[PDB]
């Protein structure tokens, strides 16, 4: 997260870390046994880390649980990043408490101009690198489709939306992928891609979750 703020411990209790001997992506807990992330975060032997704030220190709210299944969207395309969504099943159910809780799926797609909370442990600089210990937070608006498609001509599908600030300074970034965009208590977005981070006229692009709710519920139903 560039130009954001320290969220404060466990103020985002649906946020998880995907770990392979190091944090590489984020995710969102949607029930005790299932997590939502980006398809491009896919890899074998993932450890899901729930209840994290400082990913580099044991603070005593962590549940570390191994992924038992990874289900990439059947029509994910790694070149266009269309259908950049993936479901992860935990090997054992998380213990749901105050600092570890589900986020709700949306009933409807959100609209341009809504403010959302975007969070993760990604980079905080738009030039060079600085990686935080603690979870970062950003309030950002969903952009019109017109401005989205104008920022990235020919690269925005019906399953993506832009969110952020066209003047730069405030964005998601490397390390945030797979993490949540939450608008009025629903998961509307997944950190996916952009050109650079927090660059002028290059907003964050996010997977449009509302398009996927049936497929998510049926996938959970049948696995």
């Amino acid at each position: 997260i560039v130009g954001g703020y320290t969220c404060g411990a466990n103020t985002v209790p649906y946020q998880v870390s995907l770990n392979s001997g190091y944090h590489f992506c984020g995710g969102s807990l949607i029930n005790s046994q299932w997590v939502v992330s980006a398809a491009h975060c896919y890899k074998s032997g993932i450890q899901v880390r729930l209840g994290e704030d400082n990913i580099n220190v044991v603070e005593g709210n962590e549940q570390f649980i191994s992924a038992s299944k990874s289900i990439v969207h059947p029509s994910y395309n790694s070149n266009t990043l269309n259908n950049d969504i993936m479901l992860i099943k935990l090997k054992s159910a998380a213990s749901l408490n105050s600092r570890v809780a589900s986020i709700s799926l949306p009933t409807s797609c959100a609209s341009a101009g809504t403010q959302c909370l975007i969070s993760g442990w990604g980079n905080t600089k738009s030039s060079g690198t600085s990686y935080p210990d603690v979870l970062k937070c950003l309030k950002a608006p969903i952009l019109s489709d017109s401005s989205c498609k104008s920022a990235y001509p020919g690269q925005i599908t019906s399953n993506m939306f832009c969110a952020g600030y066209l003047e730069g300074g405030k964005d998601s970034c490397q390390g945030d992928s797979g993490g949540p965009v939450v608008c009025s208590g629903k998961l509307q977005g997944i950190v996916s891609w952009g050109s650079g981070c927090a660059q002028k006229n290059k907003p964050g692009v996010y997977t449009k979750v509302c398009n996927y709710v049936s497929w998510i519920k049926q996938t959970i139903a049948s696995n």
């Binding site: 590489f24 890899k43 266009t80 980079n123 490397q174 390390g175 992928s177 891609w193």
Partner: peptide, 12 residues
């Protein structure tokens, strides 16, 4: 199109 995995999409 640069994905936002750490440290990068291409670095893996």
């Amino acid at each position: 199109i640069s994905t936002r995995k750490y440290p990068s999409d291409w670095e893996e």
